[PDB]
A paper describes a structure:
Here we reveal that one such toxin, [name], is an acetyltransferase that blocks the primary amine group of amino acids on charged [name] molecules, thereby inhibiting translation and promoting persister formation. Class II TA operons encode a non-secreted toxin, which inhibits an essential cellular function such as RNA translation or DNA replication, and an antitoxin, which interacts with and neutralizes the toxin. GNAT superfamily enzymes catalyze acetyl group transfer from acetyl-coenzyme A (Ac-CoA) to a wide range of substrates. Here we show that bacteria can acetylate the amino acid on charged [name] molecules through the activity of [name], an atypical acetyltransferase that displays unique structural features including two positively charged patches at its surface that are essential for toxicity.
We designed single amino acid substitutions of predicted Ac-CoA binding residues intending to block Ac-CoA binding (A93P) or to allow binding to Ac-CoA but prevent transfer of the acetyl moiety to the acceptor molecule (Y140F). The conserved Y140 natively coordinates an oxygen atom of Ac-CoA to ensure correct orientation of the acetyl group for transfer. We then purified the non-toxic T8Y140F mutant protein, which can be produced in large quantities in the absence of its antitoxin A8, and solved its crystal structure to 1.7 Å resolution. The asymmetric unit of the crystals contains a dimer of T8 with an extensive dimeric interface burying a total of 4,739 Å2 of surface area. The T8 monomer consists of an acetyltransferase fold, and an Ac-CoA molecule is clearly visible in the electron density of the active site. Compared to that of other acetyltransferases, the structure contains two unique features: an extension to the α3 helix and longer, curved β2 and β3 strands with an insertion of short 310- and α helices (η1 and α2) between them. The dimer interface is also unique and critically depends on both the α3 and β2-β3 extensions. Hydrophobic sidechains from these structural components and from the α1-β1 loop are buried to stabilize the dimer in conjunction with several hydrogen bonds. Examination of the surface electrostatic potential of the [name] dimer revealed a positively charged groove leading from the active site of one monomer to an extra patch of positive charge around the α2 region of the second molecule of the dimer. We modeled the coupled acceptor stem of the phosphodiester backbone lying in the groove with phosphate groups interacting with the sidechains of Arg-91, Lys-33, and Lys-36 and the positive surface of the α2 region positioned to interact with phosphates from the remainder of the [name] molecule, with sidechains of Arg-77, Arg-78, Lys-146, and Arg-158 involved.
Author numbering:
A (entry chain B): 4 to 161
B (entry chain A): -4 to 160
The structure:
Amino acid sequence: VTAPEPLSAFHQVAEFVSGEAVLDDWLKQKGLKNQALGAARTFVVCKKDTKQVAGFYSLATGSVNHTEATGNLRRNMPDPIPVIILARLAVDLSFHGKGLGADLLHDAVLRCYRVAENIGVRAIMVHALTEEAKNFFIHHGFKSSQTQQRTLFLRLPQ
Amino acid sequence: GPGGTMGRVTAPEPLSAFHQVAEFVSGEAVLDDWLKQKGLKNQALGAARTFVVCKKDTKQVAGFYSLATGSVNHTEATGNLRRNMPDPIPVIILARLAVDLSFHGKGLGADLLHDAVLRCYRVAENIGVRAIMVHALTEEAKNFFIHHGFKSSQTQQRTLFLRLP
Ligand SMILES: CC(=O)SCCNC(=O)CCNC(=O)[C@H](O)C(C)(C)COP(=O)(O)OP(=O)(O)OC[C@H]1O[C@@H](n2cnc3c(N)ncnc32)[C@H](O)[C@@H]1OP(=O)(O)O
Ligand SMILES: CC(=O)SCCNC(=O)CCNC(=O)[C@H](O)C(C)(C)COP(=O)(O)OP(=O)(O)OC[C@H]1O[C@@H](n2cnc3c(N)ncnc32)[C@H](O)[C@@H]1OP(=O)(O)O
């Protein structure tokens, strides 16, 4: 695949299938529209020598109240806690099991660290859609909320 | 205007341990004390990023502002801010803004706000952001933001927004 780049009208998305239709349909129907609105910024990777999207993720600003956080995350912090929402992350079924999911997450993390140089950010927050998704994030260092087991956080040490 | 001094200040730069803040006074003690007690600590925690301007040829702070990520529910927004948007709406919070009493009335409050706005537009290239949000501490502060293009929430006059796209 190609290096991560911003979603554009040059990207072919209509055939993308990840196994989660809510994510597939968001990419195809709302991805580019929501970029113009300031609702989310989407980054894609493409099959080599094509503009066919092989995987993507989306980032938006956000916050979390102390009750949905963890004991360590809320320590000595204001309420609510400033976060970046990793709103969506998916790889096409044809590319599963090749480390592209991990690679996309790593790119997202680095981009959040860069954003955090100019704006206050405590953590990356994700809402896991399934138990399998939650376990993927746990494997990569995310920690669950105490009240919602599918809300997870990755503290950005600074 | 001339304000209280005709000395200059430096360009905005990140708060650091090299900055003197202990003598800063803005007319609002809550802001003065946040800067002195929490400014640098909160930077390391990821609670807020603070940018300062200093008296020329010193490291003495003459003004500052602070930025953090945040969001707002549709009920607390405006119709134009929320139309076709997810709920809640992604924003950047202008958490703190203050100038030392000695430099009031010189356009430094406007200059700091302008630098804050440009910094938000740069951030927005990498992350979804709909608007800058501010909670005005006083009536005087609210009117200052209105003069520079911010719009009040319909329910709360002291919560104001500046749309970016
Ligand atoms: C993002 C949200 O908002 S929540 C929804 C999450 N997204 C989805 O569920 C959409 C459908 N699923 C997918 O798109 C993919 O399965 C992804 C993106 C979750 C993972 O990508 P994949 O290609 O399957 O995994 P990839 O090959 O990158 O695996 C990377 C590492 O994670 C591990 N891993 C992958 N899936 C899981 C899992 N469910 N549980 C634990 N570990 C996992 C792999 O074993 C590998 O580990 P290693 O480096 O120690 O060998
Ligand atoms: C950010 C928050 O969360 S709210 C808290 C805001 N901060 C504070 O209250 C701390 C105490 N006050 C201050 O530090 C300062 O008064 C500031 C930073 C708010 C403003 O800075 P000042 O030095 O007073 O104003 P500055 O000289 O930059 O004024 C710039 C312009 O705005 C105008 N202006 C200033 N105050 C007001 C006001 N209250 N109402 C309308 N217009 C105003 C000025 O006349 C000038 O207009 P122009 O550019 O058309 O000539």
